[PDB]
Amino acid sequence: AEKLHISVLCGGQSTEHEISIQSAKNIVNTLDAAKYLISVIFIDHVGRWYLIDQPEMFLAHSPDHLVKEGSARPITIAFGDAAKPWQSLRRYSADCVFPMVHGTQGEDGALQGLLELLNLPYVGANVQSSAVCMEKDLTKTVLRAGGIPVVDWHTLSPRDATEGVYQRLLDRWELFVKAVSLGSSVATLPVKTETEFTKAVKEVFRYDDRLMVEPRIRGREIECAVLGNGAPKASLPGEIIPHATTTTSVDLSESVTKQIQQIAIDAFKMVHCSGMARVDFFVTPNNKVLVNEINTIPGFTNISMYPKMWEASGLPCPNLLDQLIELAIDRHQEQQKLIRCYEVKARS
Amino acid sequence: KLHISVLCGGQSTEHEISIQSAKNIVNTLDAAKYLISVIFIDHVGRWYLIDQPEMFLAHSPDHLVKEGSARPITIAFKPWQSLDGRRYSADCVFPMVHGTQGEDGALQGLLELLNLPYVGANVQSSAVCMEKDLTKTVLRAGGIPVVDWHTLSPRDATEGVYQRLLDRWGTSELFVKAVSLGSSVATLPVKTETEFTKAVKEVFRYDDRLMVEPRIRGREIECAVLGNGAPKASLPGEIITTTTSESVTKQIQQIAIDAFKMVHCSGMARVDFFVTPNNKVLVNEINTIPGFTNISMYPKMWEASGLPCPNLLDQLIELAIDRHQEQQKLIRCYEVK
C-alpha cells in the first residue's frame, strides 16, 4: 500500500450526533489526501454502522442521505482480522481509526473498547482514560488526588439523601447541578434556592445515574489543547464565553498562561490520556487556575476550539491530524509489544 | 426462557481460567430459566458461538473450534451473526473473560455499544478496578483504607526512589507490580536497590505503568460483593489453600461494600484485603471479574453465606437486566430532553 487507510467514525447514539458529523467532515476534508485513503464509518441513531469509502461524498452530503441513496454501505466488524476490520453486510482495511463520536458511546470508552477488541490503532484516549475523563467527578477525584487544582464538587447518587446537602454545600462554598457524564445543557442546572436544588437533582437523575453539584465560580473559561502520548504539548490557551463566543486570543499574564499550559499537560498525564485532550479551566479573578473538565473527543469542526487553538499555536490542522494518527499508531505498536512480551513470559 | 450468552477465553493470560469459570457457570445456570449460548474468543481475537451448552461442557472450546461446532461469528449492530447469515439471540451477556480485554472495560464497551444487558461492572468501573493504582487512588480519596502504593511510569527517574519508599513505608521489602496485570510474572518482590531497579525494568516490558507497594504482613482476606445500588457482602474468605473476629469481620464486609460503591461497581466484585496482625484492614484490589470456577472464591464465599451458585447466577442476571432497564430509561429520557 502507498497510503495508510484511515477510518473516521462519526454519528452515534449520542445527543452530539450532529456535531460529530461536522467534526468528521472537517477531519475528512483536512486529512492529507497524499498520505491517507479515507473511509468514513457512520453510526446512525439506532446504532447501525455504515461505511462510506468515497470521502468526497461524505463531504458533499449528509450521511443520512448516503444511507438512503445506498452509497453508505451497511457493515459489521470482522473480529480477529487485524488488517480489515470492517465487513460489508467484502472486507475493508483500516490502519488507524479516528473515533469522532462525541459524548455517549464515543468518549465514554465504549467505542474505544470495541477498537481494542479489534486490535486496531485509534486516535485519542484509551478505554480507561476515556472513562475517567467522561465522568467529570471521577476526573476531579483523580486530579485532586494528584494535587491538581480543580473546581470543587459534590457527587450525589440516587440513594443519597438530598436533604441538608444544599445547606452543607452553601456552607462549604449559586450552584450547578450537573449530570456527571452528560454534556448537553439539559443536564446542567443552575440553582439559587433549596427548592431549585432538589428540583434540579430530581431532574438530572432522570438523565444520568449520578450527578455532581458545583459552586458557580466567578472567572473566565479558559481552554487548552493538549497533544501527545508520553510527552504531551500544550497549545496557547483559548477562551470561551457562554452566551458561545470563542477566541484563541486571551490576554492572560505570562504566569497564568504558563500555569494553564503546565496544568493541562500534568492533568493529561494524570488521567493517563493519549493522543489529545482539551482541558477546560476556570481562571478566577484572583488568577487561580482551576481545572473543570478534560474532554477527550473535543469538537473538531473547522471552528472548534481544539483545532483552532493548535492552529493559533503554529500547528495547522492537517499536521495536527498527522500527529494524532502517528501517536495512535505508536501507542498501538508499544501496547502490542508489551502484550506479547508479557504473554511469552506468562506462559513460560 | 431468557437467552444467556456466556463470554469466555479472550486474548488474556487468564484465558484458561476464563474457560473454567465459564464451564462452571454454564454447568450451573438453571436450565429451566435459560437458553445458554457460549461465545468463545480465541487467543488471536476471533469470536465463535456455541449454541449447544452441553458441547461446551463436554469439550474444550479449541476442540469445538477445530470440529466446527464453535461457529465463527460477528456482531449485528439478536447481537450475534454467523460468518448462512443466521442471527442469534441474547437477553443478557455474562462476560467471563478475566484480565485483559475482559475486566478492563473493552468487552463492556462493546456490550454497551450493542445495548445488551450484561453482568458485572460497567466500562468505567471495570477500567477503575482493572488498573490497581487508579483503584486505590479512587478508594483512598473516598476514605477507604488501602495498602500504600507508588506509581511509576517509564519516563520517571528511578534514582533514589527505592530509598524514598523505604523512608515512607519503613520496610525494605517491596513489591514491584504491573498496574493492570495479574500474572505472578508481573509482580516481583524486591528487597534491595538493585532488585528494585531490575524489577522496574522487567515490569516495564509488560505494562506501561507500574506500582510499588510495601510488603504487608498479615492475612490475605477476600469478600464477595453482590448487588447494584444495594450491595450485600459475603462472609470473608481467606487465602493461605482457601477457606470460607466479629468486629474485623464487620469491617471487612462494610469496607467491601463501600469500596464497591466508591468505584461505582455493579453486579459483583471480589474485594481483596490484607488484615495485619494488629487487625488493620487494608483493601489491596477489587476484582470485577473474579474467578468463577467450581473452586473459585467468589462463588464459594457466597455458597458459604447461604447463597448457592445457581441462585447467585440468577441474581447476577436479574441485576444485569435491571441495570440495563434503568440505564435505557435514563438515556431515552435524556435524548428526549
A-contacting residues in B 120-159 (Cβ below 8 Å): 123-124, 127-128, 130-131, 134, 137-138, 140-142, 153-155
Tell me how far CA of residue B193 lies from CA of B160, B172, B174, in angstroms.
9, 9, 10
Number of CB atoms found within 10 A of residue B310's CB: 14
Contact B7, B107 (CB under 8 A): yes
Cell of A132: 475517567
Tell me how far CA of residue A200 lies from CA of A103, A157, A213, in angstroms.
21, 13, 10
Which residues lie across from B95 on neighbouring strands? Answer: B7
Cell of A117: 477488541
Tell me, yes or no, whether A301 and A233 share the same domain: yes
Backbone angles phi, psi at A290, to 5 degrees: -130, 125
What value, to the nearest 5°, has the Cα angle with vertex B67 and ends B61 and B71?
70
Tell me how far CA of residue B225 lies from CA of A138, A210, A289, B236, B321, in angstroms.
22, 21, 40, 10, 18
Q: Which CATH number belongs to the domain containing residue A230 in this structure?
A: 3.30.470.20
B130: Cβ contacts below 8 Å, ≥ 6 apart: A128, B103, B104, B105, B180, B288
Give the three-state DSSP class for A265: helix
A45-83 as b/e, with b when 16 or more CB fall inside 10 Å?
A: eeebbbbbbebebbeebebeebbeeebbbebbbbbbbee
Round to whole Å and give the CA distance between A82 and A333: 13
Number of CB atoms found within 10 A of residue B67's CB: 10
Round to whole Å and give the CA distance between B92 and A186: 31
Q: How far apart are the first and last CA of chain A?
A: 37
Round to whole Å and give the CA distance between B122 and B107: 10
Which residues lie across from A178 on neighbouring strands? Answer: A188, A212
Nearest-CB residue to A110 (from B104, B123, B183): B123
Number of H helices, E strands in chain B: 11, 17
Tell me, yes or no, whether A57 and A166 share the same domain: no
B122-152 as b/e, with b when 16 or more CB fall inside 10 Å?
A: bbbbbbbbbbbbbbbbbbbeeebebbebbbb
- Residue A120 DSSP one-character state: -
β pairing state of B150-152 and B210-214: antiparallel
Nearest-CB residue to B112 (from A82, A110, A186): A110
Q: Which CATH number belongs to the domain containing residue B162 in this structure?
A: 3.30.1490.20
Q: How far is CA B93 from its chain centroid?
A: 15
Backbone angles phi, psi at B80, to 5 degrees: -100, 140
Select from A189, A217, A245 the last residue of a domain.
Answer: A217
Select from B174, B192, B216 the last residue of a domain.
Answer: B216
Give the three-state DSSP class for B178: strand
B78 labelled as ligand-binding?
A: no
Q: Searching chain A, which residue's CA lies closest to the CA of residue B209?
A: A272
Tell me how far CA of residue A228 lies from CA of A204, A321, A324, B326, in angstroms.
35, 12, 8, 38
Q: Is B238 an 8 Å CB contact of chain A? A: no
Contact B252, B223 (CB under 8 A): yes
Contact B130, B103 (CB under 8 A): yes
Q: Which CATH number belongs to the domain containing residue B102 in this structure?
A: 3.40.50.20
Round to whole Å and give the CA distance between B13 and A217: 48
Query: To one decimal place, what's the resolution in Å?
Result: 1.9
Contact A49, A62 (CB under 8 A): no
Round to whole Å and give the CA distance between B65 and B126: 29
Distance from CA of B231 to the nearest CA of A (A): 12
Tell me, yes or no, whether B283 and B336 share the same domain: yes
Taking contacts as CB-CB distances below 8 angstroms, the residues of chain A near B81 are 76
Round to whole Å and give the CA distance between B333 and A104: 14
Round to whole Å and give the CA distance between B190 and B200: 10
How many residues in total does chain B contain? 337
Number of CB atoms found within 10 A of residue A1's CB: 7
B164 labelled as ligand-binding?
A: no
Tell me, yes or no, whether B223 and B313 share the same domain: yes
Q: How many domains does one find in chain B? A: 3
Backbone angles phi, psi at B98, to 5 degrees: -90, 145
Number of CB atoms found within 10 A of residue B260's CB: 29
3 state SS for B116-136: CCECCCCHHHHHHHHCHHHHH
Backbone angles phi, psi at A88, to 5 degrees: -70, 145
Tell me, yes or no, whether A182 and A235 share the same domain: no
Number of CB atoms found within 10 A of residue B290's CB: 24
Q: Is A127 exposed, middle or buried (0-12, 13-18, 19+ CB in 10 A)?
A: buried
Round to whole Å and give the CA distance between A235 and A222: 12
Nearest-CB residue to B155 (from A131, A186, A230): A230
Tell me, yes or no, whether A254 and A346 share the same domain: yes
Cell of A119: 486490535
Q: Searching chain A, which residue's CA lies closest to the CA of residue B110?
A: A114
Short-list A230, A249, A221, CA closest to A312: A249
Rg of the Cα trace of chain B? 21
Mutate to test the interface with B, among A51, A116, A157, A184 (most CBs of B within 10 A): A116
Tell me, yes or no, whether A145 and A292 share the same domain: yes
Short-list B91, B116, B125, CA closest to B324: B116
Tell me, yes or no, whether B195 and B225 share the same domain: no
Instruction: Read off the amino acid at residue A214.
Output: E
Tell me how far CA of residue A179 lies from CA of A293, B42, B113, B114, B175, in angstroms.
13, 39, 20, 23, 39
Tell me, yes or no, whether B228 and B204 share the same domain: no
Tell me, yes or no, whether A24 and A162 share the same domain: no
Give residue A71's domain range.
1-123
Nearest-CB residue to B109 (from A109, A135, A182): A109
Q: Is A83 an 8 Å CB contact of chain B? A: no
Tell me, yes or no, whether B158 and B237 share the same domain: no
Instruction: Read off the amino acid at residue B276.
Output: T
Tell me, yes or no, whether B226 and B131 share the same domain: yes
Select from A199, A217, A235 the last residue of a domain.
Answer: A217
The residue written with cell numbers 495547522 in the block is: A316
Cell of B167: 523512608
